[PDB]
């Protein structure tokens, strides 16, 4: 009607009780000139879904339709526009819609007509579950390597993470024996958390530079490591601290 | 003695405070890195593949 | 006093580290966001590269 877009595309207005009631939605749809039904049909291209219950389970098992959240309909109402289909107001979907989303990226939503922005990326990252499931060391090293391939070492703090830099944390390579409640080994152990430098607790063979931590008493230990290794250990005097490289 | 006892607890509290907030930082940071690389690795995968079906035409 | 001097330096190091790590997370989250949208765009450019050249044969 006034929308001129609500024509065609049978709408299954039966689940819109999230916070708004049922009738107002279909009254506004009819004002906009939209189709009304409360059951799946051959012309029913989309089915709205508010609260989630056994009918959603049926449409999941009987995959005749999809799940459409009322936010898209509210956006269409307030803007007088046909908002496209993106994976934020989908829960259940048809397989044909699954390869429709395969056009986007795979199923996450990568519109080739509308570029990615802060909102899309931030909210899909918030929505998508955790990927931190395996050992942090190997995954962080892979992140480091792909960063070095693309020169992505741009963290505001650069002392421990993935920035092709390594910081020693032990006086001798042991079970924190030389710490003995009074050296700076515990602080160095606690320092590997949120900075930027390739995550290696000890014995980094991929970095030729040796940096000296806050423990300046390891200079004899550093020289012993230099004698026992093939890496050149040099004493100090991009980290905004006494730890630096010349 | 009393002042060192409190700041030893304060050091342990801030160690707990530093660890608890930061543990959610890398876990989210390494989530974004891993959620993205699968998109990165596979987007260019069809890019180099579909480019091969170009030169046939 | 040596333990306290360590602990005072311990507390100050973590207190200085706690402040900068919480602040850097807000930047790093946006930093993660910047490097991914450009990649999605740069992949989209080579998606846009293939669409117009498969238009013709």
From Swiss-Prot, chain A:
Residues forming the BRCT domain are: 1-90, 155-246
Tell me where in or outside the cell this protein is found: Nucleus
What is the role of this chain?
DNA ligase involved in DNA non-homologous end joining (NHEJ); required for double-strand break (DSB) repair and V(D)J recombination. Catalyzes the NHEJ ligation step of the broken DNA during DSB repair by resealing the DNA breaks after the gap filling is completed. Joins single-strand breaks in a double-stranded polydeoxynucleotide in an ATP-dependent reaction. LIG4 is mechanistically flexible: it can ligate nicks as well as compatible DNA overhangs alone, while in the presence of XRCC4, it can ligate ends with 2-nucleotides (nt) microhomology and 1-nt gaps.
The family classification in the record reads: Belongs to the ATP-dependent DNA ligase family.
Q: In the record, what disease is this protein associated with?
A: LIG4 syndrome: Characterized by immunodeficiency and developmental and growth delay. Patients display unusual facial features, microcephaly, growth and/or developmental delay, pancytopenia, and various skin abnormalities. Severe combined immunodeficiency autosomal recessive T-cell-negative/B-cell-negative/NK-cell-positive with sensitivity to ionizing radiation: A form of severe combined immunodeficiency, a genetically and clinically heterogeneous group of rare congenital disorders characterized by impairment of both humoral and cell-mediated immunity, leukopenia, and low or absent antibody levels. Patients present in infancy with recurrent, persistent infections by opportunistic organisms.
Assembly, per entry: Interacts with XRCC4; the LIG4-XRCC4 subcomplex has a 1:2 stoichiometry and XRCC4 is required for LIG4 stability. Component of the core long-range non-homologous end joining (NHEJ) complex (also named DNA-PK complex) composed of PRKDC, LIG4, XRCC4, XRCC6/Ku70, XRCC5/Ku86 and NHEJ1/XLF. Additional component of the NHEJ complex includes PAXX. Following autophosphorylation, PRKDC dissociates from DNA, leading to formation of the short-range NHEJ complex, composed of LIG4, XRCC4, XRCC6/Ku70, XRCC5/Ku86 and NHEJ1/XLF. Interacts with DCLRE1C; the interaction is direct. Interacts with APLF.
What is the recorded name of this protein?
A: DNA ligase 4
Q: Which residues of the full protein are shown?
A: 654 to 907 of 911
From Swiss-Prot, chains B, C:
Outcome of swapping residue 49 to A: In XRCC4-Ala mutant; abolished phosphorylation by PRKDC; does not affect ability to bridge DNA
Its annotated compartments are: Nucleus; Chromosome
Q: Where is this region: Interaction with LIG4?
A: 36-57
Q: What is the effect of changing residue 48 to A?
A: Abolished DNA-binding
Please describe, based on the UniProt annotation, the reported consequence of changing residue 17 to Q.
In SSMED; no expression of the protein is observed; complete loss of function in DNA double-strand break repair
Q: Which residues form a coiled coil?
A: 1-21, 40-57
Which tissue types show expression of this protein?
Widely expressed.
Q: Which residues carry this modification: Phosphoserine?
A: 49
Q: What is this protein called?
A: DNA repair protein XRCC4
Query: What is the organism field in this record?
Result: Homo sapiens
Specify the taxonomic lineage.
Answer: Eukaryota, Metazoa, Chordata, Craniata, Vertebrata
GN (gene name): XRCC4
Task: Give the residues of the full protein shown.
Answer: 145 to 201 of 336
């Amino acid at each position: 009607k006034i929308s001129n877009i609500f024509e065609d595309v049978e709408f299954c207005v039966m689940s819109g009780t999230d916070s708004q009631p049922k009738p107002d939605l279909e009254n506004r749809i009819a004002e906009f000139g939209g189709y009304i039904v409360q059951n799946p049909g051959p012309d029913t291209y989309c089915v709205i879904a508010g609260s989630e219950n056994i009918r959603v389970k049926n449409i999941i098992l009987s995959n005749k339709h999809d799940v459409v959240k009322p936010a898209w309909l509210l956006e269409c109402f307030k803007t007088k526009s046909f908002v496209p289909w993106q994976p934020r107001f989908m829960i259940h979907m048809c397989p044909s819609t699954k390869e429709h989303f395969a056009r986007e990226y795979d199923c996450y939503g990568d519109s080739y007509f509308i570029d990615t922005d802060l909102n899309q990326l931030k909210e899909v990252f918030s929505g998508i579950k955790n990927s931190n499931e395996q050992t942090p060391e190997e995954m962080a090293s892979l992140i480091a390597d792909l960063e070095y391939r693309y020169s992505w070492d741009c963290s505001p703090l650069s002392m421990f993470r993935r920035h092709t830099v390594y910081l020693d944390s032990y006086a001798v390579i042991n079970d924190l024996s030389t710490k003995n409640e009074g050296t700076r080994l515990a602080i160095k152990a606690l320092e590997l958390r949120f900075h930027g430098a390739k995550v290696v607790s000890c014995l980094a063979e991929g970095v030729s530079h040796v940096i000296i931590g806050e423990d300046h008493s390891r200079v004899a230990d550093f020289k012993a490591f230099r004698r026992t290794f093939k890496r050149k250990f040099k004493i100090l005097k991009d980290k905004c601290e006494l730890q630096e490289e010349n | 003695q009393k002042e060192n006892e409190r700041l030893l607890r304060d050091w342990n509290d801030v160690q707990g405070r530093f660890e608890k907030c930061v543990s959610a930082k890398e876990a989210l940071e390494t989530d974004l890195y891993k959620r993205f690389i699968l998109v990165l690795n596979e987007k260019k995968t069809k890019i180099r593949s579909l480019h091969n079906k170009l030169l046939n035409a």
